[PDB]
Structure 1
Amino acid sequence: AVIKNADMSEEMQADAVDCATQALEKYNIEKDIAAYIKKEFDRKHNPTWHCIVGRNFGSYVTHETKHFIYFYLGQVAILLFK
């Protein structure tokens, strides 16, 4: 997995950047991949998050408290916030 920029809970971010392999191997489509990744992240970290995975989409909106990163994995990216 890779990244573009980061201002986040880097412990939770770098934990998720290697925990998302479970959903990537688990699911089989970008919608289902993002679903199975975010469900695992919500069960693990906390009951408040927001992730948009995939590519070919842009975003410039205000972030949450302590999470903001564009962390990718082989040009199938993730936009992560709390």
Structure 2
Amino acid sequence: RKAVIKNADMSEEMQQDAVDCATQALEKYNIEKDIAAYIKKEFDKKYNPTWHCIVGRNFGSYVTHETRHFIYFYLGQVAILLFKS
């Protein structure tokens, strides 16, 4: 799975954490919603609430995110949006 960061307002290692977490999610689950759930819940845990996650191959978004807490990246064949409101 190739990781490609598209848009990030977020620290280097927090970004790395998003990738690592997303990797674990893709290994366990195949359904986008469940994958999205995994990532969201782990970021709530490690970095405090409240995070939202979108995982898919085809979508556009327009969201307002708290600063230093936004990432949008591809991991293999899916795109992942993760952010604090």
Tell me, yes or no, whether TM beats 0.5: yes
RMSD: 1.6
How far is the alpha carbon of 1:19 from its aligned partner? 2.2
Higher normalized strand content (fraction of residues): 2
Q: Is the 8 A contact 1:12 1:45 kept in 2?
A: no
- Distance (whole Å) between structure 1 residues aligned to residue 23 and residue 29 of structure 2: 10
Superposed CA offset, 1:12-49 (max 9, x none): 12112112211111112111111122112222221222
Following the alignment from structure 1 to structure 2, what is the Cα–Cα distance between the partners of residues 55 and 64?
25
Aligned pair count reads 82
Q: Deviations over 1:38-75 (max 9, x none)?
A: 11222222122222111211112322132222111013
Identity %: 95
4+ runs deviating over 4 angstroms: none
